[PDB]
Structure formats: C-alpha cells, structure tokens
Design a binder for these strands. Structure first.
Lengths: 129, 130, 95, 150
RNA sequence: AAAUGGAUUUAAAUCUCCUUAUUUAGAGGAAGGAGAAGUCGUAACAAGGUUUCCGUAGGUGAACCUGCGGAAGGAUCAU
RNA sequence: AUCGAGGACUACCAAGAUUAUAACGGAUAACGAGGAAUUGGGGUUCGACAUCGGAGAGGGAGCUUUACAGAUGGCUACCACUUCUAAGGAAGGCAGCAGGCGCGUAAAUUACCCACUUUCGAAUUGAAGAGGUAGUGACGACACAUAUUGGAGGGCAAGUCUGGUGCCAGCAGCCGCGGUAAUUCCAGCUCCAAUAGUGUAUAUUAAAGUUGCUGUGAUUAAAACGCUCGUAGUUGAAUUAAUUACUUUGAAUAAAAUAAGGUGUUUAAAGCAAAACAUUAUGUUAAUGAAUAUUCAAGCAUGGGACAAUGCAUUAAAAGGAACAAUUGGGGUGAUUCAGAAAAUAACGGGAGAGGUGAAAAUCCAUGAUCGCUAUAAGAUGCACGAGAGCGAAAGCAUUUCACUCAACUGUGUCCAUUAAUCAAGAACGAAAGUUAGGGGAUCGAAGACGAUCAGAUACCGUCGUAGUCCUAACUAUAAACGAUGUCAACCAAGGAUUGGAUGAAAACCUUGUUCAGAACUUAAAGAGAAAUCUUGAGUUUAUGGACUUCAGGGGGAGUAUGGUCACAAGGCUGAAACUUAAAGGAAU
RNA sequence: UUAAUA
C-alpha cells in the first residue's frame, strides 16, 4: 500500500528526468509534496508546477528543465539536531556548493541553508542535486 | 524493519546473526578454558618426555624433529617444534621448556602434521642462543 | 545454468499436468514436455499400391489412411532422430 | 489487490465533479427522505436503497440532494439496522457455507473459504467495536449467528 | 552484683538424604578425520556407456539397484 | 520493632504480584562510574588499579564500647590453620608497608625521615610504612651522543655474488624453495629497513561494505518458510488559517582526563606556574586559573507547531470491505452416467505352435494355446480434442448430466468511511511414498523366484509375482513442494498475438477501434549484473533509505551427537562442539 | 550383444 506519498512523487520525478521527459504527473497531491516542490523551485531545479483539483486529493504536473539530477526522499525522518547538519550533508550531498537537503521544521519546510540561518532543526525529508 | 520506532528487532537481529561469526563465536563460547592446551596464556612451561620426528605432507619430503611436552598448569601432553637447524641435540630430557605458539596458518603450521607449538627456551636461554 | 528459458516444457500458468507414455521407451513424461509428432500414412506402401489396385473387387475404392499421434520422451526423441541437438543461438528458433 | 487472493481488479464507480444536484432534478428532500424511508421499512440494505432511488427515481447521488448520506438519514429516522450492513452480509455467507458443510464433510475448498470469511468477520467486528457502532458485548458465534442472520 | 538454673531470638558447626553443575574410568558398539602410491569393484563427470538429481519404501559386500511421484541443474526452447 | 517510612516482623482478612516490551532461571576468566586503546563518519573492545560510590579482612555466625562498627592492627563460639611450652597451659590472623614460600609466561628494598600535603591528640612542640626522599626498574612517554636487531623469491625495500650442503639437513606466518649448477638451506662479502631499539608469541582495534543504523547478500557462488490465515510488533492516503514526541535556548551539574587559551620547563613530554617590562621591593597588580566547552540516556524551564502518537464534525483514494447486474471457471463436494483397451469366464471354428530377445532361454499349449466372432460381471482408467490455453493459496484439477457451493473479472451518480500492508507465538490445506482398520483386488509392480548377459551381475533385458497401486475413516507433514526469484505499493522503451469482459463500427459465430483484468512471447545501440542472462525486472542502488517478515556468513565434521517436543512407527521441528583443511564453489573462453 | 583399470 502507499505508505509514503512523497517517496512515490520523488521517484516519479527522478525517473522522468533520466528519460529526458519534459513534464511529469503525480497522482496524489499533498501539502508536503507542494512544499518540497517549492523548495526545488527557489533553487531553479524545476520550472514550475500546476495542481489540478479532482475532488479526490488531486494531481500535480511538474515541468522539468534538464537540471534535476536526482531528487530522493529519506526514509524514517530522523530528528536532525542543528549539530548534526554537516554530518548529513557530508553523507547525502555531492559537495559543499551543489546540493541541498530538505527539512520539516516548526517554521515550515526549509532546506539546510536557511534552516541553519533560522537556527532550527527538525525531521529530514529528502534532498536534490 | 527500517522504521523509526523499530529498534527492538534491529538490535535483536544483530544479537542472533553475530553467533554465525566463526572467528567471533570461538573467542566467546567456553572453549578457550577447556579445549585449549595452552589456555589464555601466551607461553607455557612443561617437561620434555619424548623426542619425536614427524614426516611432512605429500608435496614435501623429510622428517620434522620435535619434542613431546607435559605442561605444568594443566597436565596435558603436546608436541613442540625445535626451531632452526640442529636444535634437537640441545634439548635434554625431563627438563623444563618454554612453549610458545606459532603463527596460526590454516590452524596448523610449520612441522606440518598437526604441530602448533614451538620451543623457545631450554631451561637455558634460548633454543636460539644456546 | 538455465539452458532454456521455458525449462524445456510448455507449462506456464499451472503447477501439474498429467503423464503420457513414450511410444518407444514406455517412459512416463508429462504431457507438455513430451515430443508430440503426428503421422498420416496409407495402409499400403508405395510399392504395393499398384498390385492391390490391379486385382480388386470394388469399382473405384479409395485406399484409406492411418492416423496416430506419437509421443516420445527426450531420450528416445534424440536417439530416434526425431529431433536433433541444435546450435546455442539456433535453439531459440521455434518455427 | 484483494485481501486474500492475488487478484487485482480496479472495477470502481466514478463520482462526477459536481457535488450539487443536477439542474434537471426537481424532487425535494421531503420526497427523497420518505421514498427512502419506505424502502428501509421493507427490509432493504442501505446500499440497495440508494440503487433503487438511482434506477427508478433518478436520484443517483443522495448526498447531492439532501446533503447527508443514506446511513445518516436512516439513523435519524431510527431505521438503521442494529448490525451494520456490510458485517451482516458477511455473516449471512458464513452461515450459508456452514450449512452446506454439514452434509458435505469432504469439501476441503469450502472449509478454506469459510476460514477466510470468518477472518473477515473478526476484522470487521474489531473495527466496529473501536468505532463504538457495536457494543463490546457483541461476539460472533456459529451457534448463534444462524438465528440473528436468518 | 559475680558464679549458676530455665525459656525465647539470632544461629555457626556437623551428619543423613535429594538435586544440580563440572571433571573423569570403563569391556564392548556405532562414527568422523588424517596417513600409507594396500585388496574389491565402476557409482559420478561424454547419451560416462541403464540421462542425472530430489522425497519416500525395500534390498544388497561396496559404491548402489529397483518401485511410486516429481525437477531439468537434459541429451528437446521446434510439427 | 527501629533513629524512621515499610510485610521489617506478628494476628486476622482478601487473592493477589511478574511475564513474549523476555519474568523466573543459567553463564561470566562481572565490583559500578569518571574514564582508556583504536577510530573519516558510525562504531568495537577494555576499565582489579590516581578520584567518587559499594563490599571484605582465612570461612560463616553472635556481640561489647561509643555519636558513628555487626569493628576484626576489638571480643565470643564452631571449622581450617600457625606459633610458644617447663606437657600443666597460652595468642595469632600481612586482601597494611618491606620481606619469605608456593603458583604462574608474568611483576621491585626486610632503606631513611616527618622537612612537603594532610589527619589525630590534653595541642604552635608528639606521632603518622598516610606522605616525602632514596634503591631495583628496555612496562611505557619526551629530548639527545657515535650500534644493534631483523632481512635480501613474491606479499615487501634489498644479491639472478661465491663456498659447502644434495627432496637429506632444513627454510617456510601464505604461495613455495630444496632429487648434486639451490636467487629461499648452512656460511663469507655486500646493502635493505628501523635505530638505542629491534624480532617473536597471545589478545583488542583498524583493515572487515567478511556482522551491515550509515552498510552487505538470498536465480545459478551460502542463503526466500510448500502455501494461506493470524496475535503481539513494525508501517500506515489526502484533509482543519490537552498532553507527549521533535526542535531552540538555558538552569543545575566533582575534580582528574579529552579538546582547547596563555606561559621559551634551553625545545619537547610536562607543570600551572613565572615573569615579558616595570632593570623588578612600588605595580603592570587587588597579577594567571583558559569562557576552561563538553556530555549521552533520563529529569526541570523556555520560544515554535511543520512532521508524528494518545485526543474527546471534511471527501469518497486507479487503498480496502460490502451490495447488485451480467458472465467466466479441466475450482471443490455429492449423486448420476458413457466408453472400449487389457485381462477373466462361457460357447463355437482351427489344429501346432505361442511368448520373448541382439540371439536365446525360463514360461504357456494336444486337458486344444496364440488367433477369429459373439456374449457377459467387477476393478481401473478417462485417448484422439489437449494448446507455452483455463481454474486454484499451494499441493493440484480432463467422459456428460443434475444439484450444493466458492472465487474472480467486468459494469455501476449503490453503501461504509481507514476498516489497511507485512506478520515471532498459533492455526487450516499440504504430491508421491509410508502406517492403522474395513472393502476391492483388473493392470502394473519395491521385496522375492527363475532365465539370459558378464570374469562376476545380488543390476540393466525377458517371465512369474507378495506388500502396494483403487475407495472409505484416521495418521504422517516431507519433495529439484522450482519461476531454485517472499508479500504489498509507485514509475517504467518498441511491438505482434492470445484468454474473459465492457464499449463503437461492420450482418452466437467471425473481422476491426478503444479500454480493464490474466498466462505468456519478440526486439533493444538503453538500465543492471561476475557473466549466463533479467525487461509485467534480477531496472529506478557508493547519486547507497517506499513498508514488513524469513534466511546466509570459506569447505568439511553435519542437519551429525545430545537435550526438548510431536508421531502407532518410519520419521518430522529445534539443533551444536571437538577436530581437520587453503581452498571448496559460480559464469564464461 | 559385450568394452573393467592406470
């Protein structure tokens, strides 16, 4: 059964970009899925997206432009203390200038860079190069 | 069990799966104190009682000189090599010797037919300097 | 390992099939695995057809044929030259 | 897929993207409630009640007309059956299989499917007890279900 | 208020059973491993000369043989 | 009763307390902690021993004094010891400092003094084997002169130099070198590494992504339960403008140690002191004490509420369940029913062979066989149709009729509203063989008996033939139970065909368009893999994490021994160790 | 038809 909708969405997006597809469709939409896409847009990894309302937790269509190498979700969302940031980036990201994590915090869903600026930790969601 | 609250099974699986480690189980179960003639000791002392010569394996030829030792701490009977050239003539009978291991090879080592122990002293100094 | 993708059988969506008897060995082989060949021949050989037709008591009686289905085990299909051992890349041909 | 066998079918219904009643529909809630009320008194399951309204009265969705579901309507009138409809039909099948099994003792496939059916009953009974639909004193028994289901 | 008599409390010590644990002797029996280029066969790898293997049953100096049902890891992806 | 709570003890009353989230037991070569060794991150192993806490003084037990002891450099008794003795009797407890015996691979002087730190005392003064100084000290650490240790085939830097040795002696951690021309033995010379150190042996750590959270593998190398149901456990769709968990700051918290701040112990390891300059009594100065930070698991407070759990009214998931309509089904059960092969019997014809083999033989036949026709009655079986077709959780399921069931697909503006997925313990079904008791007993046929073949043949070939093969009831619970590929879910390159539906066209059957479900097949310069090969995955994995369960750790010993449990039995489930060995194994040329 | 071993 669908345990993690975000995992399904990020696997659909990564698969689409490996094939060079222009746009992809995600069937179950969520707040967390929308927030993850917004973080990826602020770094200009996806052009934009639209949300269709099907009265049944509608679908999302995401436009991709040759820039998203891999976006993946992280299984059980570990409680990331502020001191554990660089330990996670050293493991999940390619270098110190390229990628960005995604964390869910009381101040919303933010990447590692601005969560460090806001001085707040939380559960880790995923990443993208 | 890769979940966030699944720490009971993850910890319990490593307890069970660790018993299949041949090198790790041997050092934990109670056999070093009953089935080891040397025991935990690195070196052991015993009395020489018989001078022996063991033939080597098939792809080799010759007689491996060695001695039979009766240890003090336990009382078991073992066989001990006599290191380098012509060192068996230096070893007398009914005297105390220091017996100390070998590498461990595929368990047995260098006098071929099952010997795993080498005489390092003859009461004296060394079945080296001697 | 696997010399054949289908394991030499013709069974895909089931677990068991009945047995048949080799026409030469008498061996028991499953129905799908057996080498099935069909034979349709006249009851009179090509030499004797003329002789029978000469002295016959019927106007234009047409000689009947015999029909029987022969099933062979793998060992008795190869030995009897029913089938031959083929190339590694020619095994895949099913025509 | 299905709970107990590897079958996987997606035969569903498709609610239209219109939560309000269609323009051509003119019957008010009073006729809908009483027509549904009369059907409940006749001993008809709520799932079948809605179908009869849809096929005959053209009221395909009742929530689009009255604003509340069929079961909520029946509870307000007090005509909702004490045993939930889906659980009731499951115990009707377990009784029927058991009756056939009394005379045919050698049927080993009916014994397997009876086991699957009763496992479903214990799954639904557990859920409805957490939902407070069924009192905790309720318990499914073969020697008893033959009478209440009847 | 000292010797001393008596009754409780806490009870060492010893004896008799019983249990557990560890070590160790034993005629004989059934095993495993290693060595010695010892007798007897040809079981397996080629269609290994009766295709091989698995479960079970029986038999036999020995590998093993045979009955029933499977598998191809077959020597057939094919009428 | 005690200083005091308290089953701490007593009397009466009640039946309670703990346990799969591991109680009760067993082991420890187990005192706990601060900490130590090694580590990229995560971790692994150790901690008797500086300091804190606990316990003990040969073994228990019982007490005295006192504010504090169940004290032992106090006492009493018992056990095991040791010493003196005038033979009557007596004290003593080095797990205090030295030292001695024993034990072991393994560990120092029967020294001097209270001068430093501090404790006790009637007190500025006396004691202190606490403490300090000295002696032994290649356990280790630091600085520093000018020589030893191991090796020279590869791993691994260094000799295809010369003398002896002749598969011997030997070297050799592993591969291996040595059978007379040794690069490996024993020596001589030379140089290779480190250097006051350097080899060996055992053990910890890294190497080991060969114990996996980060982080493994399960088709074929070892490894997916035979299959389904199922409790605990784990994981759970979207959705809303009181606690807990999470997160940020702190409070409080012994030092030593770790990190780290300052400081020329001549540097350094150290120490926390010394001075830099004031040429310093003066002055910086009332000088330094690193802020010394930690720090995990709990506990306390604080700001936030995104992601989550327990709270106490949204929709209608290409989640799930139920209902209905039309069907599909070698799915199952019962009854009914058809077929003729083989063999048996009855009658008739015929009259010398028949079986069987490579050739034969054993065997059957004149009591008439084999062969031919016609009749019967049981057992069993279910050809051709029959397929890379269908159904079933798997095992498995095939003459046609009638019932009883069941499941699934499709169709749906029908209902519920999270009811779900995977699942230790537990439970149904589980081929064939085998067991128990009845019936049946045709064919075939483990055992057995003959005849051939062979050197032998207990086998292959032929003939006969018991248990069995068949049905009913009850056991057994194993297979190469295989797709050697766990269950659920998402994404996913081109096709042609097929099974069952729905829906248009073309007049049930058939040809076409679309779409749902099922068993499959072909192509790939792409993805993966050690390759074979996989593509309705074995793909989306060092760019490693969707959920859950089971299993594997070189080959043997061995699925063996023992223990437990199930069975009438055979056997099934769980299941080692000693010892042995440098390979065993997988795919391909 | 028979064809064992180094």
């Amino acid at each position: 059964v669908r345990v993690n909708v975000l995992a399904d969405a990020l696997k659909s997006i990564t698969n689409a970009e490996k094939q060079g597809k222009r746009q992809v469709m995600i069937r179950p939409a969520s707040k967390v899925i929308c927030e993850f896409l917004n973080v990826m847009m602020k770094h200009q990894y996806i052009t934009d997206y639209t949300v269709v309302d099907t009265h049944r937790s509608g679908k999302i269509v995401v436009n991709l432009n040759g820039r998203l190498n891999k976006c993946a979700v992280i299984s059980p969302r570990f409680n990331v203390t502020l001191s554990e940031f660089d330990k996670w980036e050293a493991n999940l990201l390619p270098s110190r200038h390229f990628g960005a994590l995604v964390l869910t915090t009381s101040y919303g869903i933010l990447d590692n860079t601005e969560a460090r600026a806001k001085h707040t930790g939380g559960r880790i969601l995923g990443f993208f190069y | 069990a890769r979940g966030l609250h699944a720490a009971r099974k993850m910890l319990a699986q490593r307890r069970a799966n660790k018993w299949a480690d041949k090198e790790w189980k041997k050092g934990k179960l109670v056999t070093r104190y009953k089935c080891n003639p040397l025991g935990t000791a690195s070196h052991a002392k015993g009395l020489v009682q018989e001078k022996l010569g063991i033939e080597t394996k098939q792809p080799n030829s010759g007689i491996r000189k060695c001695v039979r030792v009766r240890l003090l701490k336990n009382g078991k009977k073992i066989t001990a090599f006599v290191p380098r050239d012509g060192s068996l003539n230096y070893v007398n009978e009914n005297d105390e010797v220091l017996i100390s291991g070998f590498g461990r090879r595929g368990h047995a080592v260098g006098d071929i037919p099952g010997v795993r122990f080498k005489v390092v002293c003859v009461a004296g100094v060394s079945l080296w300097g001697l | 390992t696997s010399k054949r993708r289908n394991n030499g059988r013709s069974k895909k969506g089931r677990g068991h099939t009945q047995n048949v008897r080799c026409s030469h060995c008498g061996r028991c082989v499953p129905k799908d695995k057996a080498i099935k060949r069909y034979q349709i021949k006249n009851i009179v050989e090509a030499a004797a057809v003329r002789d029978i037709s000469d002295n016959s008591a019927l106007t234009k009686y047409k000689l009947p044929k015999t029909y029987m289905k022969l099933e062979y085990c793998v060992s008795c299909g190869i030995h009897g030259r029913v089938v031959r051992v083929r190339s590694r890349t020619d095994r895949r041909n099913r025509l | 897929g299905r709970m107990y066998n590897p079958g996987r079918g997606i035969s569903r219904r498709c609610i239209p993207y219109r939560r309000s009643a269609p323009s051509w529909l003119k019957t008010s809630t009073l006729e809908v409630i009483d027509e549904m009320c009369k059907l409940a008194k006749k001993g008809i399951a709520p799932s079948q009640i809605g179908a009869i309204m849809r096929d005959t009265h053209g009221v395909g969705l009742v929530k689009s007309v009255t604003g509340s579901k069929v079961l909520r309507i029946l509870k307000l009138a007090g005509l909702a059956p004490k045993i939930p409809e889906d659980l009731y039909f499951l115990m009707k099948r377990a009784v029927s299989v058991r009756k056939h099994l009394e005379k045919n003792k050698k049927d080993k496939d009916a014994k397997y499917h009876l086991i699957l059916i009763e496992s479903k009953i214990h799954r639904l009974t557990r859920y409805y007890k957490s939902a407070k639909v069924l009192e905790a004193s309720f318990k499914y028994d073969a020697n008893t279900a033959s009478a209440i289901v009847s």
